């Protein structure tokens, strides 16, 4: 009857168990083991200078208050039991509307090993913010970065550490492209310390090196701005006395520029400043204005 | 807290060695363990690690197939045994703990391994 | 492999004025570097963790400073138990080190 038998185990290890309390509170800096699986690498919002990414969240962290011995050397449990115990109060810095996936049922694993190792995963779709310089549109690479770390917990209390080789620690899966107008070349981990108000904090950063792609802005932009500047060249090969003709070519050339201006500033966001997409838009009004 | 590696090794060509590394003050399977040489007179290079609480192992590219990492998670220890070694492996051998940051915080004495006649 | 190149192969500082010494890798390492004392007859001892961050009862006047592929160690008071050769090893990936860097006292 392993029914009883595992049932007091559990009972034992939540008995005068406290999850207000750190692992090693009063004697020790409570060690935390981090890894990122991204499972898909979600689409990229210029417009909202934001990212999504799908990920396996995984935490990982010694508790001694959850030594057991059974007959079996792990416990894999519900994640009801997750919110009976201590977890980490990890949150993304950059991170601007997350969701935590419940469906059918919450997206969480705990394991626990016989000498009170804990293994905590969790499913999660993380939006966060990715400032882009847009200078040199559309052919522009950014570098999104995502930083996460604890909230109430300062460097003295909880520290964060990659899992494996910094190197390794945050793998994408090779079918996890959810990307239309950007290649993902790669990616860059560190580890630092920020300080605020309340004290310095671990902060563990993820940088993804993103480049643009060209494609939709020559099919929809630079093809037909250089179509419209041949069409205005056509009109010197016609005859000096097809006055109205001649008029029709210059006003009717000059208005598509406007017309092509007019749709190619919605692609971008609102900036304030001309982009390289601008200036080839201008010069070749330029020439067709001349 | 405390490494302890094996005494000085005279070890003919062609034979197989194997090194020992007992920890003190802390359960190997918390962290990685680091085998490393130095030739004497020279700069340090990274042999391998392990991973105690799973056997996962890693190796240079340059020592793969001749050098080969276990635990005893039991004796608290590592072992690393170089199996072909010719006459050029003679290096004191270091054995390591990853630290705080991946930095090799704690290191052990030194198995200076001779390989003569 | 990421290499570490660290420079010079020889400094003779004599003992109380200032020395930096040099680290370079060839691919990107975060912060993932660290500073090893080596004195002879024994084994490193860890000097600096990461970049910048002196190693628990290490002497104040090491300090450190880096990039994504530049590091420095400092040695603002350089004593006589200098007589070590120093290491420059990289964390980031598998761990490789630097060709040493040896420190004289005229």
């Known amino acids: 009857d392993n029914t009883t038998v595992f049932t007091r185990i559990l009972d034992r290890l939540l008995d005068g168990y406290d999850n207000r309390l750190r692992p090693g509170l009063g004697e020790r800096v409570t060690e935390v083991k981090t890894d990122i699986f991204v499972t898909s690498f979600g689409p990229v919002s210029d417009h909202d200078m934001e990212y999504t990414i799908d990920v396996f969240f995984r935490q990982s962290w010694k508790d001694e208050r959850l030594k057991f011995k059974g007959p079996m050397t792990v416990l894999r449990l519900n994640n009801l039991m997750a919110s009976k115990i201590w977890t980490p109060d990890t949150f993304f810095h950059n991170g601007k509307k997350s969701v935590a996936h419940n469906m059918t049922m919450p997206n969480k694993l705990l394991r626990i090993t016989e000498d009170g190792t804990l293994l905590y995963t969790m499913r999660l779709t993380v939006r966060a913010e990715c400032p882009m310089h847009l200078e040199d549109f559309p052919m522009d690479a950014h570098a999104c970065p995502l930083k996460f770390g604890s909230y109430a917990y300062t460097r003295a209390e909880v520290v964060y550490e990659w899992t494996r080789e910094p190197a390794r620690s945050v793998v994408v899966a090779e079918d996890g492209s959810r990307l239309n107008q950007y290649d993902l070349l790669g990616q860059t981990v560190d580890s630092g310390i920020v300080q605020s108000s309340t004290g310095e904090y671990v902060v563990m950063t993820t940088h993804f090196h993103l480049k643009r792609k060209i494609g939709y802005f020559v099919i929809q932009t630079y093809l037909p701005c250089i179509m419209t500047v041949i069409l205005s060249q056509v009109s010197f090969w016609l005859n000096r006395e097809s006055v109205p003709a001649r008029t029709v070519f210059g006003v009717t050339t000059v208005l598509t520029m406007t017309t092509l201006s007019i749709s190619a500033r919605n692609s971008l966001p609102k900036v304030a400043y001309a982009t390289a997409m601008d200036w080839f838009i201008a010069v070749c009004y330029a020439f067709v204005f001349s | 807290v405390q490494l302890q590696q094996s005494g000085a090794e005279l070890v003919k060509p062609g034979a197989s060695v194997k090194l020992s590394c007992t920890a003190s003050?802390?359960?190997?399977?918390?962290?990685?363990m680091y085998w490393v040489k130095q030739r004497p007179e020279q700069g340090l290079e990274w042999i391998g690690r392990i991973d105690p609480a799973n056997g996962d192992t890693k190796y240079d590219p340059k020592f793969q197939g001749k050098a080969t990492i276990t635990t005893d998670t039991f004796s608290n220890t590592a072992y690393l045994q170089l199996s072909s070694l010719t006459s050029e492996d003679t290096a004191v051998y270091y054995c390591?703990?990853?630290?705080?940051?991946?930095?090799?915080?704690?290191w052990g004495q030194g198995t200076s391994v001779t390989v003569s006649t | 492999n990421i290499v570490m190149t660290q420079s010079p192969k020889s400094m003779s500082m004599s003992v109380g004025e200032r020395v930096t010494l040099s680290c370079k890798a060839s691919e990107y390492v975060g912060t993932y570097v660290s500073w090893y004392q080596q004195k002879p007859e024994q084994s490193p001892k860890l000097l600096i963790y990461?970049?910048?961050n002196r190693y628990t009862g290490v002497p104040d006047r090491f300090t450190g400073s880096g990039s994504a592929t530049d590091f420095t160690l400092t040695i603002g008071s350089v004593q006589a138990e200098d007589l070590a050769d120093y290491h420059c090893?990289?964390?980031?990936?598998?761990?490789?080190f630097g060709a040493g860097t040896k420190l004289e006292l005229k």
């Open positions: 090893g990289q964390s980031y990936s598998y761990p490789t």
């Open positions: 990461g970049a910048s």
């Open positions: 003050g802390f359960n190997i399977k918390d962290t990685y």
């Open positions: 390591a703990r990853k630290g705080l940051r991946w930095a090799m915080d704690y």
